[PDB]
């Protein structure tokens, strides 16, 4: 759960993270750094490696989905219901054995890619609130995945 203050710094910094490309660039960097660090993850996604054209594609779709989750943070039941639906779709994605443990390393890569973009605006308060926001968004996706 996010506090009112955490919801506010997440909604505020998302404007800068989204940039003029709806976070597409942040997505490309997150997924390229993640798969370069964990080569074993390429197969879970069905990618050939970090250079596969699909990582820039999927990176834009993930960041665009985080953007609609950010627009619904004020209604928790709404945000978790729609992230559960995304999670239910993941049962049939990649190697079809996506595991809950894979989400915490992905989170670290996302927060670094966000910081890379926004610089000093991703301060300690922004990082804690985005860590809390990533915990709820992926947590709701995992619930759908395990349903
Ligand atoms: C390490 C964990 C994850 C894995 C292995 C994974 C894997 C995949 C794969 C393989 C696809 C491509 C499906 C296709 O070919 O159409 C996909 C699509 C998608 N993923 Fe993930 N995903 C993960 C985490 C996430 C997270 C954290 C989000 C949260 C926003 C997310 C959001 C999406 C979206 C929006 C799509 C596009 C299709 C749809 O809306 O269902 N994924 N994911
Ligand atoms: C998930 N991409």
Curated annotation (Swiss-Prot):
InterPro entries in alphabetical order: Globin (IPR000971), Globin-like_OT (IPR050532), Globin-like_sf (IPR009050), Globin/Proto (IPR012292), Mb-like_M (IPR044399)
Keywords: Heme, Iron, Metal-binding, Oxygen transport, Transport
Pfam families: Globin
Highest taxon in the source lineage: Eukaryota
Coiled coil start-end: none
PROSITE patterns, A to Z: GLOBIN (PS01033)
Globin domain location: 1-146
GO molecular function, one term: oxygen binding
Binding-site positions, heme b: 90
Quaternary assembly: Monomer.
Family: Belongs to the globin family.
Name of the molecule in the record: Globin, monomeric component M-IV
Species of the source: Glycera dibranchiata
């Amino acid at each position: 759960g996010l506090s009112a203050a955490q919801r506010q710094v997440v909604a505020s910094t998302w404007k800068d993270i989204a940039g003029s490309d709806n976070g597409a660039g942040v997505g490309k960097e997150c997924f390229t750094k993640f798969l370069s660090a964990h080569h074993d993850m390429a197969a879970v996604f069905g990618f050939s490696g970090a250079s596969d054209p699909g990582v820039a594609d999927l990176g834009a779709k993930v960041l665009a989905q985080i953007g609609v989750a950010v627009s619904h943070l004020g209604d928790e039941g709404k945000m978790v219901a729609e992230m559960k639906a995304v999670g239910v779709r993941h049962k049939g994605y990649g190697n079809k054995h996506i595991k809950a443990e894979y989400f915490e390393p992905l989170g670290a890569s996302l927060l670094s890619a966000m910081e890379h973009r926004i610089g000093g605006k991703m301060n300690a308060a922004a990082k804690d609130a985005w860590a809390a926001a990533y915990a709820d968004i992926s947590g709701a996706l995992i619930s759908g995945l395990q349903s």
